Amino acid sequence: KLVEGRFSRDVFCEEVVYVASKLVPLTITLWNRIQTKMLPTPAKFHYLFNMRELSKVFQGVILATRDRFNLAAGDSAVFGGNVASPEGYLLGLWIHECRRVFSDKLISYEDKNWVDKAVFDLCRDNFSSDLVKQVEEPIYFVDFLREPAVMMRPVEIVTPHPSFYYSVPGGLPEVRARVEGLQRKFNEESKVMKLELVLFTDCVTHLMRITRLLAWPGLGLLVGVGGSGKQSLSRLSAYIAGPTFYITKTYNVSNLFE
């Protein structure tokens, strides 16, 4: 209903549908299969699949459903190649969002290294290939080089925002320099918050997911060991992406009630 009936209220998906509808069953073909292989997890009780999973993987692609054809804008009206036929951007949305929702519940890294290949080989048959920089691996529908605080991110604004999710700028250092630019001055203005966070690949990966949850009535639940300063990454993604975290102090209930 919303996958294709909203491909007419926004005509920038009016004709990509010519392969897009091939995925709505296909993801279920993944989903149900994934629904039975890692679901039985006596290790930790956090393996379940119901309307939350499909709904969230669809609400993720919704904000890119108001986005444009191939680039952040693209040619914006033409379909002969990676627009209607396998786009990369279409394959992008699917593989990106599924990797965001159908892999990150896992703990075993190797289990994810098999899950992603299962996802790849599922869609492998339904089509032939994709535009590489539109699936720039791992497909970066980036929402930190696109999404953060308003008056933002000079880039072609014909998406419902300046832009919130596009894999065209897949360069990792390009993503990294932006967070340095934001964080350094955002610290310089925030005195006790002047704490600086170390940078590496996982730093790149995780803050995009944090902001993705920030771009919807989405709520977070991160599970991970200490010795990482999880509060640092959290409060960094907090204000840089727009909204302001509100500090907490507690010794009784009426405190937080007020």
Closest CA to 30 of 102, 90, 87: 102
CA-CA distance, 135 to 114, in Å (whole number)? Answer: 19
Alpha-carbon distance of 136 to 168, in angstroms, equals 7
CA distance readout (Å), 161 to 25, 114, 146, 152: 29, 35, 9, 9
Resolution of this entry, Å:
7.5
Question: Over the chain, what HEC string results?
Answer: CCCCCCCCCCHHHCCCHHHHCCCHHHHHHHHHHHHHHCCCCCCCCCCCCCHHHHHHHHHHHHCCCCCCCCCCCCCCCCCCCCCCCCCCHHHHHHHHHHHHHCCCCCCCHHHHHHHHHHHHHHHHHHCCCCCHHHCCCCCCCECCCCCCCCCCCCCCCCCCCCCCCECCCCCHHHHHHHHHHHHHHHHHHCCCCCCCCCCCHHHHHHHHHHHHHHCCCCCCCCCCCCCCCHHHHHHHHHHHCCCCCCCCCCCCHHHHHC
Residue numbers belonging to the annotated binding site for ATP: 224-231
CB atoms within 10 A of CB 152: 16
Whole-number Å distance between alpha carbons of 37 and 23: 21
Instruction: At 142, list the tokens.
Output: 């980036």
Query: Which structure tokens are listed for 193?
Result: 């918050």
Those residues whose C-beta lies under 8 Å from the C-beta of residue 29, and which sit 6 or more positions away, are 122
Residue keyed to tokens 């909204």: 243
Q: Output the CA–CA distances (angstroms, integers) from residue 51 to 40, 55, 57, 58, in the order listed.
A: 18, 6, 10, 10
Name the experimental technique.
cryo-EM
**CA 22 – CA 155 distance, rounded (Å):** 31
- Burial grade of 39 (CB within 10 A; 0-12, 13-18, 19 or more): exposed
Non-local CB neighbours of 45 within 8 Å, separated by 6+ positions: none
Known binding residues: 224-231
Task: Say how far apart CA 242 and CA 215 lie, in whole Å.
Answer: 10
Q: Can you say how many angstroms the Cα of residue 45 is from the centroid of all Cα atoms in its chain? A: 24
CA count, 13 A, side-chain hemisphere, 52: 10
| Alpha-carbon distances of 83 from 43, 47, 87, rounded to whole Å | 43, 35, 5
How far the first Cα of the chain sits from its last, in Å, is 42
Of 146, 235, 225, residue with least CA distance to 197: 235
